[PDB]
Structure 1
């Protein structure tokens, strides 16, 4: 405990010098900027200082400022010699405090002589005594190393945020104390409250570096491990606990990209623990994996082929067996769980499409594994059955039509089938090679493109584009009969359809362009023009139709506008 207090004194003094030295160096750098702006005659020096000192990231320029410790690099820095000597003197003070430099005079010498004296006195037998004694010896002999390890946990907080920092520390202490407690109702409720308080605290998103330095992302991951140890056996325990833990972790990933990196570092556990019965609804390990992989390209490149193999295995399982939860609910047995299939397809979508671009390596690996396991494509695309995507879509429409087969928040199996097919086709479309690769004519790009072309036929795609959709019309008595949300065919299906269409079969001829125009595009235009009136314009399915329009099919028209010439 005494050595811990000594180390705390060391880091506190380091923070004190941090404050003083950033004040001095900030004043010096501001005066340097003013002098450089004044001195327009020194063109080369002005350009060099503007590029290096004043056109660099703050960490880079502070590294350049502090680089004068090396004797050779005593001229690159612009700091005054007095400031250099001040930091040097504090360095000598820190070394003297750490002991770098008869009767002991300091705690270090006292502990060293003490440990050597006991160990030379007797062959001590208590293993805990041996471990503690030699750990004390090592900390006393490695004072610089102990501070070197402690400084990652060191952080400097603005004085105006101290109240919220203390509140966050108390919530952290509550979670850490409840860690050793076995999970229960009251503990779950207290964890919900603490996670909510941490999320509403402004320091959570204000200081991601302090956030990682405290590092209770690992603590709530330990909460995940503890709850999922019992959750995996039989059914999930404390689904509210699982949902709130991804609430915290998934939002933590959305806060910053470094938080995203730290969460992506532990990607393997989340995908192994993600299951259909576990994450049958809500905020899931699949969700935190998707958050850690989405909108980020370096992490998408760092994605592991073993992780892709695992999620393809889960996709194969979803294709093979029906949902036990759905069977317990009493809905008709489908033979495959489209909800879980769609969730893993969405994860693969976020894995293979980042920053508005298609990542080549991940796309190739995913399509490779997909064609290695044909059962992942679902019953429609199976080789032996040959059911056909369009015929399966019509079957799903009639399944949602007949109440007996569509009945046992609410789970609609027909829309689940449609969403599974839409997600699979969307994944293939964003796994399609880039137009640059196609024009370059790379063998792997043309090969993957041809594989997708064989996988999905043109006639089924144009049929589902031309698939008629019901329309919310006012009833005879005045009751607006709108289609049931998440139970009827939705325009997101056609959106993914046409996304695959323009990413694999980029429209280059006017005959088939006008063919799909008369098939599905113009009828959609008529439907939206009819829905334009304010009597039905406020309906959610019409708003989703407008979203489909502007986000999917209107850009295709803008792209194919030059091809429309000579019509």
Structure 2
């Protein structure tokens, strides 16, 4: 306890000196700004000065300013000699306090002689006692290293945010206290309230670095681990954790990287039953991977294999809780695979540009497992996409097959095929690469053309749509949404048409216009 108090005193003194030194360096930089702005006789020298150590990235500026530790860079650093000497004196004082350089004259020496004497007197038979004394001796001998390890946890805040900071700490304390207790209804409600308060706190999204230092994402991850291991027994717990994690991803980019570091677990636990939840670990992974080029490029093919395997399983067997509710069985599960196809679309397409490596891996996995297409586009079934779409139209039309409606299998068929077509469309190679003549790009485009014929695409594009009409007197009759064909499907298919096949002849253009 006393050693911990000493460490806390050291880090607080360091923070106070950091405040004072930051104030002095800001004043000096403003003074130098004024001096250089007034004296700009040398154009080239002024330009070079403005480029380096002048209105630059702040971290780069402070890193270059604090470089006077080296003798060569001491002259390069424009900091005043008094400022440099102040920093050197503080560094020397920190070394002296840490002990870097016979009656015990300090706690460090006293504890060191204590541990040595106790070890020498006898043969200690208590493993816990032995571990305690040797850990204490290690802490006494390693003073500067302990402070070095402690610095990442240190953080500095403004005086006006102390109240909200205390409230956030209290909520986090409730969250941590609920960990050791076995999960129940009351504990569940308390975690929901705590997560809600954390999300509503303004400091939470204003200091993502401080949140990451506190490691709250790890704590909510452990809560999610516990609830997922339990089952869903606590679907409110799972949904709240997923929403909090998605918001944490959306806050910033380094948060997204920290969430991406745990990608494998989320995809492994992403299942059909767990994925039918409103907020899922699959959604968390999608948020952690979406709209980040380097994160998409760092994707391992094992995760893609796992999600493709889940898609293949969903396309193989029917939906368990759907047939339990009593909806007619199609022999396969489109709604489960819709989520997987969305995840693959996010993985492949970023910032409106197709990732070549990810697209190639995905298309090779899909052609390797030909059971991911269901009845239509099947190696064995060979069912035309247009025929399948019209069959689903009539299935949605007749309540005998549509009814077990909360879930419409007729609309699920359309959604699954639209997602598949959209994914294959965004997996298409770029036009500049095609013009350059890359063999892999040409092969991928040829494979996509082979899988999806153009005639079937233009046929479904030309398929009719129901138009609202006030057939009843004074009542405006509309098509039943989430149960009938919608223009989003046509949008995805025409995205495929533009990406893969495209428009090349006016004749074809005019035709497509008329159809």
SS in 2 for 1:381: coil
The Cα offsets for residues 201-241 of structure 1, whole Å up to 9 and x where unpaired, read as 0011101100100011000000111010111xxxx221111
The Cα offsets for residues 64-119 of structure 1, whole Å up to 9 and x where unpaired, read as 11122222211222111111111111111111111112111111111111111111
Structure 2 match to 1:179: 179
The Cα offsets for residues 421-449 of structure 1, whole Å up to 9 and x where unpaired, read as 11111111111111111111100111111
Structure 2 match to 1:323: 319
Give 1:409 shift. 8.9
Q: Which moved more, 1:43-52 or 1:292-301?
A: 43-52
Give 1:44 shift. 2.7
Provide TM-score, normalisation by structure 2. 0.98
SS in 1 for 2:156: strand
1:42-53 aligned at under 5 Å gives the runs 42-53=42-53
Q: Which moved more, 1:269-278 or 1:124-133?
A: 124-133
- Residues 1:424 and 1:313: Cα distance change in structure 2 (over 3 Å): same
CA distance in 2, matches of 1:48, 1:453: 56
1:404-443 aligned at under 5 Å gives the runs 404-408=400-404, 410-443=406-439
Give 1:56 shift. 2.7
Give 1:505 shift. 1.2
Give 1:179 shift. 0.9
The Cα offsets for residues 244-297 of structure 1, whole Å up to 9 and x where unpaired, read as 101111000000000000000110000001001112121110011000000111
Give 1:474 shift. 1.5
CA distance in 2, matches of 1:248, 1:153: 22
Give 1:57 shift. 1.6
2:435 is the counterpart of 1:463: no
Give 1:139 shift. 1.2
CA distance in 2, matches of 1:54, 1:237: 58
CA distance in 2, matches of 1:388, 1:273: 34
- Residues 1:229 and 1:170: Cα distance change in structure 2 (over 3 Å): same
SS in 1 for 2:155: strand
Give 1:385 shift. 0.9
The unaligned stretches of length 5 or more in structure 1 are: 520-567
CA distance in 1, matches of 2:510, 2:16: 73
Give 1:17 shift. 0.9
Give 1:453 shift. 0.8
The unaligned stretches of length 5 or more in structure 2 are: none
CA distance in 2, matches of 1:120, 1:335: 75
CA distance in 2, matches of 1:92, 1:485: 73
CA distance in 1, matches of 2:358, 2:54: 39
Aligned residues: 515
1:168-317 aligned at under 5 Å gives the runs 168-231=168-231, 236-317=232-313
CA distance in 1, matches of 2:494, 2:486: 14
CA distance in 2, matches of 1:317, 1:57: 51
Q: Which moved more, 1:317-326 or 1:475-484?
A: 475-484
CA distance in 1, matches of 2:141, 2:373: 62
CA distance in 2, matches of 1:418, 1:6: 66
Give 1:60 shift. 1.3
The Cα offsets for residues 161-180 of structure 1, whole Å up to 9 and x where unpaired, read as 11111111111111001011
SS in 2 for 1:271: helix
CA distance in 2, matches of 1:121, 1:275: 60
CA distance in 2, matches of 1:111, 1:388: 81
- Residues 1:102 and 1:273: Cα distance change in structure 2 (over 3 Å): same
CA distance in 2, matches of 1:279, 1:384: 29
Structure 1 match to 2:133: 133
**Over 4 Å off, 4+ runs:** none
CA distance in 2, matches of 1:211, 1:508: 54
CA RMSD of aligned residues (A): 1.1
Give 1:15 shift. 0.7
CA distance in 2, matches of 1:409, 1:284: 24
CA distance in 2, matches of 1:35, 1:25: 15
Q: Which moved more, 1:256-265 or 1:143-152?
A: 143-152
Give 1:55 shift. 4.8
1:492-511 aligned at under 5 Å gives the runs 492-511=488-507
CA distance in 2, matches of 1:359, 1:436: 14
2:371 is the counterpart of 1:375: yes
- Residues 1:428 and 1:55: Cα distance change in structure 2 (over 3 Å): farther
Q: Which moved more, 1:322-331 or 1:482-491?
A: 482-491
The Cα offsets for residues 36-57 of structure 1, whole Å up to 9 and x where unpaired, read as 1112112232112211223532
CA distance in 1, matches of 2:306, 2:405: 28
Give 1:13 shift. 0.8
CA distance in 1, matches of 2:125, 2:49: 64
SS in 2 for 1:72: helix
CA distance in 1, matches of 2:99, 2:419: 63
